[PDB]
Design a protein around this ligand. Sequence first.
Ligand SMILES: NCC1(CCNC(=O)Nc2ccc3cnccc3c2)CCCCC1
Ligand SMILES: NCC1(CCNC(=O)Nc2ccc3cnccc3c2)CCCCC1
Ligand SMILES: [Cl-]
Ligand SMILES: [Cl-]
Lengths: 299, 299
Amino acid sequence: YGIHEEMLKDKIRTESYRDFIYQNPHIFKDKVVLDVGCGTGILSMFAAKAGAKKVLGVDQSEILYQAMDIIRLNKLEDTITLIKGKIEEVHLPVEKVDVIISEWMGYFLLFESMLDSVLYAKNKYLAKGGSVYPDICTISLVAVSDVNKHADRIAFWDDVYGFKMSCMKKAVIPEAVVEVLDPKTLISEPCGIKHIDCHTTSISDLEFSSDFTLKITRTSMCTAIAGYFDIYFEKNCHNRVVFSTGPQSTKTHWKQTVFLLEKPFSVKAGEALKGKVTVHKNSLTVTLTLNNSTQTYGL
Amino acid sequence: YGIHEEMLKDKIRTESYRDFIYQNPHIFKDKVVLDVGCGTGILSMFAAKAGAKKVLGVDQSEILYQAMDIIRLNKLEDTITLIKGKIEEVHLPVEKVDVIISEWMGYFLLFESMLDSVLYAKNKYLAKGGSVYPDICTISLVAVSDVNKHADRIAFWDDVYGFKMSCMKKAVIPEAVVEVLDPKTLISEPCGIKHIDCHTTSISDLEFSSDFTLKITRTSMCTAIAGYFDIYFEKNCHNRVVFSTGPQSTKTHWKQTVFLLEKPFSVKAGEALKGKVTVHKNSLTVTLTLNNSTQTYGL
Ligand SMILES: NCC1(CCNC(=O)Nc2ccc3cnccc3c2)CCCCC1
Ligand SMILES: NCC1(CCNC(=O)Nc2ccc3cnccc3c2)CCCCC1
Ligand SMILES: [Cl-]
Ligand SMILES: [Cl-]
């Protein structure tokens, strides 16, 4: 229940979906809509208000039972049918749907995300010529300078109440941090490392490598690389919608993902800082090469 | 690792234990000490520096391996032996110990606490006349008025982006909240509902009932009851140590536990607000009767 309330109170998230649906009612009017991972049912209710003929909401979680009651309280049970289970194993009362909507995104876009279910639903159930939203997603990296926070996580361990705990550094570094960043600590322009169009992407595309260049904007000690993502509603829209989960934008419940550097290093404004990033699915991991050393991170 | 770092950076917690040990070295000099749930080993290192003959640190968690390396980095392996496993099943290299120290406390003192292991260690391993620290613990309740926060958690659900979600209130109310309270929202004097002396307490004592009276100090709408605890180091101490986890004191990682009222009710300064609280072990639950209704809460 906690995560659902939190997601609902994320105005950037929820108003973005609302605005997309309500300001592009042509996408939904008289359509059959599938809401993958429907939670409390809010997106299904948006689609119904925008004129969907039929909305199918699917979720494996027990939250679905609350969604059943919610749909009834709003007198939408003749338009919205809820079905409990995984999309891969439930029985739908139709063979195809016109439109798929989902809020599936995890931290750093792909940590513990439901994208694999959305792609499954697309391939099995989306009608020829139908649409999936949000349709376009990107992931970006940006360089960070925060010597104080680095000292808080790392140097901290050299003297803990008079005792050495230096070995703990090796357990800290590999753990990606999810936290909202002070934008004043950003020291580069961002760089896109991944572009996903949900119509054409397959599950194998979610493991990928990218060379990147960060255009440094402040001479400083680089202490971490941060990651975030942008979500786009584009296809057939008269009113396009975008939101970013980056540190320069209003915070969301996804915050930002932070990959600490074991050994901070100096950079200069105007420098082109080059590195490489690879994401693997085992429990996703992120392998980063930068300044001649490599580290793999997990969440 | 996260919780261990967090516990270490809780200065009230960690300095309290440090001060107790360092300012009462007579309790430890030439003694055999058992550290139950030793984590990174910090309390065992405090005891060694205070002159313990032998310190046995026990923990079932994988953190113990880090503790092994830490003990070696501080050159204490001839005084501190670490043993992995549950206290109930490990083999100790001695039959009895002079002193037991532990940081076992959970939210609201008893949620997911290791007190049962500490009591087991006392009965099986503590020498006749030995001591257990911290030796005295109390739990208290206090009344809270926060109509805005109540509206945020409860009234919120009546209109979510134009839709009724009223049924979700019933899932929210039973979930105790762990959070730091603004002390300006406290509207009564506290009332102790439980006193534990770890020398004489048994496991059956941890389920208990208490009638309580809260002396109201501000005429206001009561929206929640908050809980917290105090920890004492007393027995044989020349320098006694206490700390509170209450909202009037410096925050700790235990914060405070908040039990929301479904139906807030008016109270008057000088009123004696009477209720009853019972804690049960199933996953502990807390049953509260107040203002003629009863609710059971879990964490
Ligand atoms: N979960 C709370 C903890 C704090 C995690 N925060 C955290 O590590 N945040 C940041 C942010 C930016 C940084 C930039 N450069 C270097 C290090 C940085 C660390 C403290 C308690 C232990 C667990 C991590
Ligand atoms: N875990 C974060 C959430 C906030 C929990 N906070 C929270 O419920 N705190 C408080 C504090 C004092 C109160 C006094 N009277 C009435 C209600 C009160 C609620 C928001 C997101 C959903 C989960 C709970
Ligand atoms: Cl940015
Ligand atoms: Cl108080």
